[PDB]
């Protein structure tokens, strides 16, 4: 589990969104596994606006933050899980790191701020849903 809290937005994995998230929906995209809802309080996270390929992510199944090198956001085939059939997921970055399903939501960050959240993984791989192209998260 986990979310990004920027401005009056809460960014979560679409497959982990609650009824309150769907009832206060701003935007959602199943192909990216992302959903954004509105918040009453302002958050403290800042979004990275960059092309970094190195950063650090949080792994809840290890209580640890790991430094990783990660690929550029791309369209990648992801195997079936409890939440999606086997399919192509867009805007996804891969790194070598430990992941388990409840690890989704952990933040990946670089020197510029938050890059994205854990969304896929398995077999020593971890996938991140990128948020750096969602410029509207910085306003309104
Ligand atoms: C970090 S998500 C995760 C991690 C380990 C195992 C499983 C998951 C989620 C899942 O069932 N799959 C199916 C296979 N492909 C995936 O990348 C995701
Ligand atoms: Zn960066």
UniProtKB/Swiss-Prot annotation:
Catalytic residues in the record: 15 (for protease 2a activity), 33 (for protease 2a activity), 104 (for protease 2a activity)
Biological function: Cysteine protease that cleaves viral polyprotein and specific host proteins. It is responsible for the autocatalytic cleavage between the P1 and P2 regions, which is the first cleavage occurring in the polyprotein. Also cleaves the host translation initiation factor EIF4G1, in order to shut down the capped cellular mRNA translation. Inhibits the host nucleus-cytoplasm protein and RNA trafficking by cleaving host members of the nuclear pores. Counteracts stress granule formation probably by antagonizing its assembly or promoting its dissassembly.
Subunit structure: Homodimer.
Chain positions recorded as Zn(2+) 1 binding sites: 50, 52, 110, 112
UniProt source species: Coxsackievirus A16 (strain G-10)
The protein's name: Protease 2A
Reaction it catalyzes: Selective cleavage of Tyr-|-Gly bond in the picornavirus polyprotein
